[PDB]
With several copies, the nearest count.
Chain A
């Protein structure tokens, strides 16, 4: 049960951050003037590790989830 729950959460986060790694939620591609993107609040050290600083992984995920949801079902339609 715990394996299934943790795997579902991990897979959701991995898919979200593998989508928004070059994709910018504010359109186009990311603009890294630092570890942090300029158009968004994406840090470079969050894309691949979602466990060291989970709060910074739960903030970005919370910011661009609804749109992520609309985009996700837009490809999978028609």
Chain B
């Protein structure tokens, strides 16, 4: 959502070699990855 707010305010500026569409997609793909700590709730529920 913060990336979308930057897009709506025109605060997203792509680097040289990327269009704004490609940079926005790169930001969204990187922002929507699960962290390593997603296994803390999983390993709290299970008995190894």
Contact = CB atoms under 8 A, between A and B. Distances in A.
B16 A22 contact: yes
Contacts of A53: none
Interface of B: 6, 10-11, 13, 15-16, 20
Interface stretch (A11-19, A31-39, A40-48, A54-62): A11-19
Contacts of A15: 6, 11, 13
Interface residues of A, number: 11
Interface of B is mostly: loop
Interface of A: 11, 15, 18-19, 21-23, 72-73, 75-76
B16 A18 contact: no
